[PDB]
């Protein structure tokens, strides 16, 4: 049984006095406003529900939450206390507390909390009477706790704010260049009750040992880890099952001798987990119940879906690795993972549109970014029923941290919480720290070397000029994990984003300066008010490829977005047609957290930009791409998956409409196979890639010449290819 | 696994020559990494090192693990014996067949081979109607009794498992299972004695290259079926006497043929012969180097599944070894004959 405690709660706020409350009594004694809250939520949504804020995603009214930050925030209501038999344990648990906080039940404290990305369960089966139960949490100010701390040379003038050094929070919350300054607070995740019998498993760790997709068989271990009264020991069995769409294929009973045993299963008749490309992603459910022997009840049951894959990242400079999935070398393509929404209790929400565009443009890996959150448990479910490599980076950003002792206790009980809660998924391949750093190099290191042998651990842009300047097409890495190019977003969200009169980017009508909200919303993490900076990168991308900024917004939102495509389309064609030295390409990035103006090829809202159109092509199975060269062109073929494919490729001129190629292409399995040299092509144009596999017709195109171009020649082109809507 | 001996047991030690290799107590596998058990672990170690290292028998330190990235192994345990003990090292961690006439670690320390216990042991481990090993008279099938007294930790029906190494190594070097309780005995006795024989005086005979052998269990510590050569109640079993004869300070034997000596000691004539035939197969004197193997002479290589004996006699005392050449499946009866015939055991 657990009965959720979620719903409406009673909300008490109030500056927070130079000693911060802590205490039942002091929080109803202070002088505060007292409005109705939502559970899973965070407090700026409360406060905006009963209009004491304004809408933060709208022009500049994200600095008007700034004097909340030194605010206290006092959760309370009432539950009804569940039957609870002798020598069952009642539980609180907490999905997620922001942050420092103090919880009570019934006047007594039952627990602090100090960390808002792990769990937090509290037994409250002595406090809990009979009747109307009262739970009371008490949040203080997350800035103010930073100055409890004295910080290192090292840890002040990183981009990550330091006031998220010495603490364990989101470093993305306190702002950064791609998502606001909204620190927030409150119960942003599921507050539940579990009811816990004297027998109840502890943890399920499954782990793959080997496996052969071939002979369709694989070696699953399940370590289990159960609390288990010596009175009911030789008397509980334990039920493994492995089953498919309600059939079976493995049922084994074991008598509980001890009370931690690991069961290595030879399963038979099993598929193996793939990434997308690489084969189906084949998932089981494997359910462990312990029934007594005697008389037949179930004490405890963990159901969930494991996947029977192997990671093996194969080492030779950053970059200088492949992962290997199942024995095969896969080429990884793939965004970063960035903040679903500044007000994080709403992450549930978005989990299920935001993974959808990742399956729609077809990645095989995705790269949860160090400055969000840790993403539940359905990200996780979903990366594994879509077949989406995961690769997650410790809620750590730029910057060194803390050398000492305290520290590094409060992030090893975060990294053994998150570790094995995450570690039953086939999608997740790989822990990174994003940092002689005794957290990038030990602490990390030390969890992951005893709760997670399994995977692998790895310790460990530029100028942002011409996308095929050197800085890019000779960077000796064979593994990016993070390069982006700036585009403005579609008119809809602008006109939704700004106010009215701040729709329109020139300030005062002079192209390449920007108004104060479009400036706002680059992202500033605080009122300074300047020109230039971060936004300046759109008008001097567009100046470079296309001459001159257009003065028109629609006129420059088609120029932003198709060098920003242009530009995305260029990299992963380059690091596809590179191989097999190029294994993997990780852009920034797929979607956004706010209303912002980003480098990312989506909004917050919706708003596919043009770069989101231009990258599902050159992101297929088998794609046909034209590479640049010396003297001419190289038109390639990239395989993502483990077959054969033949077919027919045409490649023409848009402008003039002659042929410049058309024959038969053979591309083989997991790899990059060169088709023919193309002659080189007078001025400037665009050529146009059509192939058919299956009697399927798929596009892509080439733009060949050097800059600057013209805008409304561009533009023709485009139309003419048909490929993609202007 | 066992308990740190009390100080008695390092003062006999100290008292008789005998070297102590004193591992930290823990199991064969690998433990906690965080901060809770490395203090409890040091807590220990301090005071077991404290404790122990005044005595000139304790010779090493060891943590008994499998790597190198073990706190407990390579830090927690390592710090102790840096700052607690400076002096002794520390460290974190068929018979004939390749795996061990071939194998290149230059100081064993986990050789064994399984041997039944005596018939008196075996009337007072199980009960009056369990004494007799085979369940309703079918050979190679243990009964429950059998079962449990070789170590089966918890209450779990099965039928083989570890007591099939005796039924194994008896068919493979003497053809089959002796039906008769005293010829098993004899059987297992004599697999273990000749296995674990034949292993010191490899090593000795390799001496050069190797470096030491350390084999398993010379008493055992509860009515139960072993690799040990003695048992709880104090039964020695042949295994005792066959490698007391390979053990002596100046010992003779033959290894696969070459008759050599080896000398255990810093201080500076033999006679072959076959049991049954009584040709003298080789007589002459030798020079035993200290610490040392010397070699005598290479043998011929006699025909027949027989045995040899190896008397040998230095400063007036004799001595005696034997050498059983062939190769299995070999006889019981026969066997049992051959060393009758060669005086020594019984």
């Not at chain 1, 490309?277 to 963990?302: C, F, H, N, Q, R």
């Not at chain 1, 300047?469 to 984003?497: A, K």
């Not at chain 2, 061990?100 to 481990?125: A, D, K, W």
């Not at chain 2, 006679?271 to 043998?299: P, R």
């Amino acid at each position: 049984s657990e009965q959720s405690l979620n719903g409406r709660w009673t909300l008490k706020f109030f500056p927070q006095p130079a000693v911060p409350v802590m205490t039942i009594e002091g929080a109803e004694a202070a002088n505060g406003i007292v409005v109705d809250a939502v559970v899973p939520g965070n407090v700026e949504i409360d406060m905006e529900a009963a209009g004491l804020v304004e809408d933060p995603m709208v022009g500049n009214n994200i600095y008007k939450l700034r004097p909340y930050e030194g605010y206290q925030w006092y959760y309370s209501r009432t539950f009804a206390a569940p039957v609870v038999t002798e020598g069952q344990r009642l539980v609180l648990h907490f999905g997620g507390i922001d942050t420092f906080a103090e919880v009570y039940v019934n006047g007594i404290k039952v627990g602090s909390a100090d960390n808002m990305l792990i769990e937090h369960d509290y037994d409250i089966t002595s406090v809990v009477k009979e009747g109307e139960n009262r739970l009371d949490v008490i949040i203080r100010s997350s800035v103010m706790e930073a100055q409890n701390h004295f910080l290192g040379t090292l840890s002040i003038g990183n981009f990550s704010n330091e006031e998220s050094a010495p603490v364990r929070r989101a470093p993305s919350t306190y702002g950064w260049d791609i998502m606001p300054r909204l620190v927030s607070a409150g119960l942003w995740r599921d507050v539940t009750l579990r009811v816990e019998n004297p027998v109840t498993i502890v943890d399920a760790n499954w782990v793959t040992l080997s496996v052969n997709p071939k002979a369709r068989e694989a070696s699953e271990s399940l370590y289990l880890q159960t609390r288990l009264p010596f009175e009911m020991h030789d008397k509980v069995k334990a039920v493994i099952t492995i089953s498919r769409d309600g059939r079976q294929i493995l049922r084994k009973e074991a008598l509980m001798r001890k009370f931690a045993n690991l069961f290595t299963l030879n399963l038979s008749g099993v598929d193996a987990w793939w990434p997308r490309g690489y084969g189906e992603p084949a998932l089981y459910t494997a359910e462990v119940s312990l029934v007594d022997v005697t008389s037949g009840k179930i004490y405890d049951t963990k159901t969930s879906k494991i996947g029977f894959r192997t990671v093996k990242l194969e080492l030779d400079q950053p970059g200088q690795f492949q992962f290997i999935i199942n024995g095969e070398p896969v080429f990884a393509k793939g965004t970063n993972w960035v903040p679903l929404d500044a007000l994080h209790s709403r992450d549930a929400s978005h989990v299920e549109e935001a993974v959808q565009l990742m399956v729609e443009m077809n990645c095989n890996i995705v790269r949860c970014w160090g400055g969000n959150v840790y993403e539940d448990t359905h990200f996780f479910e979903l990366c594994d029923k879509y077949g989406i490599m995961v690769w997650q980076d410790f809620a750590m950003g730029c910057g060194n941290y803390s050398q000492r002792d305290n520290f590094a206790a409060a992030l090893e009980k975060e990294a053994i919480s998150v570790v094995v809660k995450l570690r039953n998924h086939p999608s997740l391949i790989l822990w990174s720290g994003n940092n002689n750093d005794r957290v990038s190099r030990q602490v990390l290191s030390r969890v992951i070397y005893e709760f997670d042998p399994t995977r692998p651990y790895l310790p460990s842009w530029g100028p942002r000029g011409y996308y095929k300047d050197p800085f890019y097409t000779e960077n000796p890495s064979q593994f990016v994990s993070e390069i982006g190019y700036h585009g403005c977003p579609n008119r809809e969200t602008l006109e939704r984003m700004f106010s009215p009169d701040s729709v329109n980017p020139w300030q005062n009508g002079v192209v390449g300066m920007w108004n104060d909200e479009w400036q706002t919303k680059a992202n500033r993490i605080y009122d300074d008010k300047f020109q230039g900076g971060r936004n300046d990168l759109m008008t001097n991308q567009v100046r470079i490829i296309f001459g001159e900024v257009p003065a028109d917004l629609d006129d420059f939102i088609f120029a932003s977005q198709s060098v920003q495509a242009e530009a995305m389309k260029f990299f992963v064609e380059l690091w596809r047609g590179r191989r097999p030295y190029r294994t993997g390409i990780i852009w920034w990035n797929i979607r956004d957290g706010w209303p912002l103006l980003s480098d990312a090829i989506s909004d917050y809202w919706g708003g596919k930009k043009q770069a989101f159109y231009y990258m599902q092509n050159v992101h297929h199975d088998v794609c046909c791409l034209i590479n640049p060269a010396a003297n001419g062109y190289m038109l390639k073929v990239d395989n993502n998956t483990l077959k054969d494919f033949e077919g027919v490729v045409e490649v023409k001129d848009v402008a003039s409409g002659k042929q410049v190629f058309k024959g038969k292409f053979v591309s083989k399995a997991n790899q990059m196979s060169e088709i023919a040299t193309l002659p080189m092509q007078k001025g400037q144009g665009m050529l146009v890639i059509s192939y058919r596999i299956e009697g399927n017709e798929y596009f892509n195109h080439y733009l060949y010449g050097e800059p600057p171009y013209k805008l409304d020649q561009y533009r023709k082109w485009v139309k003419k290819c048909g490929i993609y809507e202007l | 696994g066992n308990v740190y001996e009390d100080t008695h047991f390092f003062e006999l030690c100290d008292k008789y020559g005998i070297m102590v290799w004193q591992d930290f107590a823990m199991g064969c596998g690998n433990y906690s990494q965080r901060d809770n058990f490395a203090a409890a672990l040091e807590k220990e170690a301090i005071s077991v090192v404290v404790k122990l290292r005044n005595h000139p028998s304790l010779i090493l330190w060891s943590g008994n693990n499998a790597p190198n990235n073990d706190r407990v192994s390579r830090q927690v345990l390592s710090r102790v014996i840096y700052e607690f003990d400076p002096t002794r090292p520390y460290l974190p961690s068929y018979y004939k067949d390749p795996f061990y006439t071939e194998n290149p670690s230059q100081f064993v320390s986990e050789i064994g081979y399984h041997g039944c216990p005596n018939r008196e042991t075996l009337e007072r481990m199980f009960s009056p109607d369990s004494v007799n090993p085979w369940q309703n008279g079918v050979v190679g099938m243990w009964n429950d009794e059998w079962q449990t007294k070789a170590n089966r930790i918890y209450d779990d029906k099965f039928q083989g498992g570890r007591n099939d190494l005796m039924t194994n190594q008896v068919r493979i070097i003497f053809g089959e299972v002796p039906a008769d309780l005293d010829d098993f005995i004899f059987a297992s006795q004599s697999v273990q004695a000749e296995a674990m024989k034949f292993f010191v005086e490899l090593w000795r005979g390799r001496r050069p290259y190797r470096t030491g052998i350390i084999w398993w269990n010379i008493r055992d510590g509860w009515p139960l079926l072993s690799d040990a050569i003695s048992d709880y109640w104090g039964g020695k079993k042949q295994a005792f006497y066959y490698m007391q004869n390979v053990h002596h300070d100046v010992c003779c034997l033959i290894n696969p043929y070459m008759l050599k000596v080896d000398n255990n000691t810093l201080k500076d004539v033999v006679e072959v012969k076959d049991v049954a035939s009584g040709k003298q197969v080789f007589k002459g004197k030798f020079v035993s180097k200290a610490n040392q193997m010397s070699e005598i002479a290479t043998l011929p290589m006699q025909k027949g599944q027989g045995m040899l004996v190896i008397s040998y006699r230095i400063e007036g005392n004799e001595y005696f070894n034997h050498y059983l050449y062939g190769e299995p499946p070999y006889k019981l009866d026969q066997y049992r004959k051959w060393v009758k015939k060669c005086g020594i055991y019984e």
